[PDB]
Structure formats: C-alpha cells, structure tokens
Amino acid sequence: VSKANVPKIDVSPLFGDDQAAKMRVAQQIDAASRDTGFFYAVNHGINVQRLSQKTKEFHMSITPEEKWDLAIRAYNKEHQDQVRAGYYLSIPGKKAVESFCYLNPNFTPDHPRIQAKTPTHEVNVWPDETKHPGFQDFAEQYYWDVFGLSSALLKGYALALGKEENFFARHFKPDDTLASVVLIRYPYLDPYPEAAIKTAADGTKLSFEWHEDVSLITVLYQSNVQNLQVETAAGYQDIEADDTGYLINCGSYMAHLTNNYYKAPIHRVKWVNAERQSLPFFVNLGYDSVIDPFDPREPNGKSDREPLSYGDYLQNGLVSLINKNGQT
Template identity: 55%
Template structure:
C-alpha cells in the first residue's frame, strides 16, 4: 500500500495559467554602456508593472555552488547546533536574537526550518551593535570543527548577492527616471540591513497536518506560506531544483504559476518600493504551494540602512513626463501627499511583525 506521504507528494489541483516572468539579461548593469543599461531598465519597468516578477540572468553568481553548500550545511547540522543557533522565538536564552539565527522545525506542527544571517560587518565593535540598535545582530555560525568552510562561504555569498542587488537597483533607478545611484546611495556595505535566508522544505512521511495550510479561496489550494508581500526594497531569490511551487496573484485576483528556473535569480519589489513609488511598482502578492518534496528556497532581502528614508514621489507622473519628452526635474520629484516618508528601520520592524502574523507565526 502506498504511504500517506507518497499519495500527497503531488496533490491533485486544477491547472493554472502561467505568469509572465521574463528573463532579463542584467550584465549591462555591471558595465558602462548607458544605452544598454537603458534597455535593461525598460525591461525591468515592463516586468514591474506586469506580474511584478522577472528572472535576472547573467548575474555572475554560481547558484549551483550555493545550493550544494546549503545542502551540505543542513546534512551536517546537529540538533545541538540548531539549538545553539536558534532565535529567541525557540530558545529562551536567545532573546537578543530576533532576526538572525535558526528557526527550528517543530515535530508534528511545523516542518520548515531556516537559517537567517545578516550583514557580516555587524561585529561586536560595530557602532550599531554597541548601541544595541534594533534589527542589528551579530551572526552566529555552526561549529567550525564540523562545518569548517560554511562561514567563509556564507559571508562571501552575502557580498556576491549584494553586488547583484546593487546592479539591479541601478536598473530600477533608471527605470523610474531617477539618477543611477538613487537607491544605491542608501545601500552601503557597512550598515545595510539586508539578509540571507536559507530555507529548507523537507520531505516527510507522514507530513504533519498542522504544517499544511489551506488557501482561503474557492480552490482550497494547500499552502506552505500564505499570500503575502515581501518586506524589503527588492527581493532576489534563488530556488534550486525544478519544483513548481510559487504563485503570484494576477490583476483579477487569480493565481498564476511561476515556472521555476534555477539558473537565474527571481526578482520582485518589496512593499517599501511600492510605498515610495505610490504603487507604481507594486509589491506582488504571492504564495507558496505546499509540496511534499525536499527542496530549498534561498532569498536575499535587500534592505537599506536603519536611518535611511526615501521620500515617496509620484513615479507614474514622472514616467508620463518622460514619455512626453519632458526633460525637466520638477515632475520627477512631485511628492505624494497621501504617503508619508518612513525611515527604513521603522518600516522593517513593523513589516516583519505584520508578516509574522500573516504567516501565523506571531
């Protein structure tokens, strides 16, 4: 007789249309050609105002190595390691660990586990750490005797993907008819609040029923993660393997499958981008369909510095002005009176709290 897990490994579901997710060659964003950068920016603009997602190709990062190192990390991790790395939500001795650290699986209730690590510049003598500024934490790592190469690889990857994010933000700035450094002037190596999350979705037999969520819509789709918008400026996601699990909500409320591509980064705007552009570049609502398959999800959440603040402006008006041939600067910076400026630290703190409630983890 087939096991319960094997019967549920590929749950029957109605066929869905596929989301338009273009592949954009971002190599010109690392170069000096203004004409080629403009072409990339136009492609980013079109994708951001459509489904909100695109695949970034020719990014220069070895994603296969990232997947291999992450799988090795999980294979070598012991229960003692997990407890020592656990966030304060799991280990009461670690109340200081709110963002960074290990989120444990809970047998019979929660299956997914993850490691979140922050800016490697956040060391004991960093001014923000000394001042105990919220959202800034020193990373902890697995014991070097069991995982001698993991920390060096993880820190190196952080800077590699930050370089990709920096290039992407140059493209977003140009797409929004702003100076090329409009975003990157706020994305500094020494104080960015950006984070890497290494998430493992396991295969389990039996799979704990409380860990499977049911969508609150007519189709009753089984979910691992409820519908949400990302809390970030932009998100740069690596999804190893060929498991179709991510869905984005279309303009009519319908859910569209995002086809996987493990050679490229999947990119979308977070809710801070939506706020400052007056929803001209919205943060797409998306969800993760439940699959009983061993897989990884490796997002990089691109965040500014704690005190950084970008004043919301009428991005739609700026685009209209550019389309009409206007070359002045006034229309490009019309403030949105119904949207107040928000410092990034306050935005991130509230956004993470709200997201925890959406995912029923508060």
C-alpha cells in the first residue's frame, strides 16, 4: 500500500493582498484537486495545540448524564428539535465512536431562520458551565477561526477555477452559513467491539466505509494518527498524518458545480484502536445559496447541469446518511 500524494501548501498568501502570491497558491490547490483531491493547508495561523487540548478535555470529562442530556433525537427521543446539533453517543457493542456537533453560533431563537423553522437550521446545545467552564466560549471562537481559514481557502478555489476571487466566498456569510463543526472521538477499547469494525472487500478493517463528503469543502484537523485512505487510480492509498496542518478536500457540491472537474474524493477511515480525535469543519453555504454550474473543460465554460440551491442539496445529502453516525 503506498502513500497518497498529498502536498503541503502554504496557505498564508490567501490571507494577504498579493494577487501574484495568491495565484501561485491557487495553482497548487488546482493541481492537488485534480490529483488526489486532498492537500494540507500549512501556515493557517490557528492555535491547533489548544484546540486538541480543549477537545480531549471535553471528551474525557463529560459525564454520561450530560451526554444523555445533550444527545440528539436519534439517541434521546425527548429531543425532537435536535437533529444535527448535540451529542452522538456510543452504543455498547454496536458503536464505539462518539462525537459532538455544533452549528453556526448566530443561530439563536431570534434568528429569522430559526423563527421560520427552516430545515437544517438548529440552535446549539451546550454543556453546563460548572462542569465545563469556558468550553462554549472556546468552541464558538474556534468556529469563527476555521470560518476565517475556510473563507481564505475559498478564495483560493475560485482563483484555481479561474473565477473571480469572491465567486465562492460571497456565499459564505456568518449570519447564515450552514457549516458545522464535529468533535469526533475514537476511543481505545479492549476488547474493541467487533460490530464496530467493518471490513472492506480488500479485507481492510475500517471505522467508516467509503463515501464522498456532503459539503462544499471540508476543513479537518486530526491528531497524529494514520487512518485515512483515498481511492486513487492506483486503488486506495494512505494519507500521511500531520498534526500541524489542516487536511482539505472537496465535497460533492464542488463536484456538482465544476461538473466533476474537481471531483469529491471517495475515502474511508481505517480502524485503529487508539485514543485519537478528528475535527472536521464542513464548509456549507447559505440555505438559499445558488451558484450556476460550469465546466472549465468547455470553451463556453458552460455546463449542462442545472443550479441546485444549497438548502436542497444539504437536506437531501444529510437524509441519505445514518443519522446515528452523522458527519456534517
């Protein structure tokens, strides 16, 4: 099994005004997107050390009582209004992974979207401050930190696709973005529940089977442990770990938009019995956001695909996946 070619692109230029430097990064992004579809963003300026620290603390200290009080509808029938945001418990013998998902901090009861009960929009649930002081404040600030980085990455993607710099970004707004953060925890267990290990056809033990992300792009931070594999033309290939950078990849919405010029990499998660964490930020646009499809391989640049609002795309994509497991 070989290592997938996953370059480390210095993303910092995207935060600056040097059009020349930006274009160079856009060139490197474009090339990764058309190869493995995965690339590391290095020099992103995010205190990734505190992030892992505060997340391990949260997962290790949260009590069973709280997990249950924050559990989404799939776990706790009581919470009918919690579909995405909340705690995803582990099911003894059946599920070993746990995770905590939260949405846009601006989604308060005063928010029009929440008031109008528009699908996919929810209000975040948080643990008690006495048992987890400052957690919320840390978690909400981080949201805006990745929002910042992702916003910089989307300008890179627009340039790479030869579109105007704010082609994508213009739809990534703080007051309505549907992006979500998921704090995943992969436990260490002995014996490790057999039912929680799926075996790929080539035999590989996996925590999660193949799939394409349901997002525009996915910004992930993950502790130094190897588990990801991308399906390339040479079959599956391991992706090297790197606790300093963010692993970036396109979701099916980018594939839709670019008429597959930038495909959504199909990937899977190997099973490793080791306490580690995975923290993806799924970059989603506004509910009413619509971008007309295009094919960069065509002279006109025109595509036959018809525009699909982000709300419809998101709704469908989520309903297709296992509510109990999630990821988005």
